[PDB]
Amino acid sequence: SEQWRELWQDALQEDDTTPVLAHLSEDDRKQVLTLIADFRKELDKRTIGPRGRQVLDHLMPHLLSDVCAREDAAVTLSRITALLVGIVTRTTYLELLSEFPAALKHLISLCAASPMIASQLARYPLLLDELLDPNTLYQPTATDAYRDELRQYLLRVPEDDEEQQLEALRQFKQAQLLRIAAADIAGTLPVMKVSDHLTWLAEAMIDAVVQQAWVQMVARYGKPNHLNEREGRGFAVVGYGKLGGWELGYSSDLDLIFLHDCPMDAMTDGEREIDGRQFYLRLAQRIMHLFSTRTSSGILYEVDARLRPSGAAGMLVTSAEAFADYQKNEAWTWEHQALVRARVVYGDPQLTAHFDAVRREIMTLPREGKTLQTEVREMREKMRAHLGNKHRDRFDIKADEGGITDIEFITQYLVLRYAHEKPKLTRWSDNVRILELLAQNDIMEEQEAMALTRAYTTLRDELHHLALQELPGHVSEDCFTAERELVRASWQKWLVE
């Protein structure tokens, strides 16, 4: 125990011969000693006060004894001191680290396992709350209780206070991401379920953002007056991309478009009367603002709205009737492709019905088979020239031949080709369930649809692991040769012949 105290006290001496570091390699011991020295020098540089220095001197022998005894000492300590350096100014956070040896133990365990978590806890130290209860730290929220949990997390927050409401949503998201990532790392949640949890989480957040925006708008303008005879809001959020496709990762954007079904002559019913439609545009804008603005705990989600009709040049919100017109009369095939993946993530039953029937009608357009196949193949190839890692010796899991986008395009291709003949193909928007549908409806043999499913979930789940390690989305060309061969052969089967 004395020797751990000395490792901290004689830190600057960087004594090579300390027994406590003998288990490590020369280089690793060298790195460990430097890390400790470097940290101690920061204290002198950040000129922290007496209370801080007292807690640190108590806490560091203990902290170093856990970390530095690990085989992975050098990497682990590097992640821990980056975290500490960020919080050495907050006495309370140190005080919490000392008063609770169990929260420290999990901090070290997690940071050793995952630089993603280390970074998050370094960026958002208020998450240290989560480390004080292993029962919740490693059991993430039931997929159907995200809305209830948010509700309960928002109780303390002044409902009149935009900035606190915003900050609270950001806190909630980071807490849930930590729990999700922590359960993955502990094996408490199967990796197969990570995208599922992230997706349920985003939907809860969307629900709460819309709610917050609506209250602000209704307070300024009153309600659009067409909303009689009608329980709900006449506004809809459609999710595209990974959101649509139940494929969210830890640091994903949300691809969203916004619909209304508001008449031209509708007005809001407050004394600050505005046009019904402008009320929704402003609603949409507020929502964007509530997702993207930066508070202490960062931003909530980056929102990408570029897939709306006409892209960046289109209205921020379209009527459902204009969305239908556009899809039938103007949209490119690549837009219809993208639409295979779209689903309503917020809206009332009327507008959901409107979207569903519109999309269903676009899916089941009769399309000339080879013309479509030619279109989808040409588009894939153009994407591949611009997207993903461009190095020959690497395999971009998403972007390269035999990767995820290949599978996605195979599924979108087949729904657009065959939905006219087999309308049940429209029923789900994610790859796993689309492949299932393609088998049930005799487009694809069961062996193939299952082989694409597994290759898909394997590749998608690798990306989750890579995220956890703050590694890029490309791996050695040695990797996943069976998955790629099977996806290439399907590509060749469906898209080239």
C-alpha R_g of the chain: 27
Query: How far apart are the two ends of the chain, measured CA to CA in Å?
Result: 71
CA distance 84 to 39: 8
CA distance 249 to 195: 6
CA distance 356 to 354: 6
To 10 degrees, what angle do helices 50-67 and 2-9 make?
A: 120
Tell me, in Å, the resolution of the deposited structure. 2.4
Long-range CB contacts (< 8 A, 24+ apart) of 364-373? 364/419, 364/420, 364/423, 364/426, 365/336, 365/416, 365/419, 365/420, 366/420, 367/416, 367/417, 367/420, 369/417, 372/333, 372/413, 372/416, 372/417, 373/413, 373/417, 373/494, 373/495
Nearest to 469 by CA among 108, 113, 137, 107: 113
What domains can you pick out in the chain, each with its CATH number? Answer: 1-113 (1.20.120.1510), 114-363 (3.30.460.10), 364-497 (1.20.120.330)
Burial of 393-422, coded b for 16+ CB within 10 Å and e otherwise, reads ebbbbbbbebbbbbbbbbbbbbbbbbbeeb
Q: Would residue 357 be called left, alpha or beta, if left means φ above 0 and alpha means ψ between -120 and 50 degrees?
A: alpha
The tokens describing 432, both together, are 């796993």
Q: Which residues contact 157 (CB under 8 A, 6 or more apart)?
A: 164, 165, 168
Residue that has been written with the tokens 């837009």 in this structure: 335
* Phi, psi values for residue 224, rounded to 5°: -50, 130
Residue that has been written with the tokens 């779209």 in this structure: 342
CA distance 27 to 382: 47
Whether the CB-CB separation of 272 and 222 falls below 8 Å is answered with yes
Residue that has been written with the tokens 């856990």 in this structure: 66
* Total residues found in the chain within this entry: 497
CA distance 421 to 227: 38
Helix runs in 306-397, H state only: 320-329, 333-340, 349-363, 369-386
**Method used experimentally:** X-ray
CA distance 120 to 127: 9
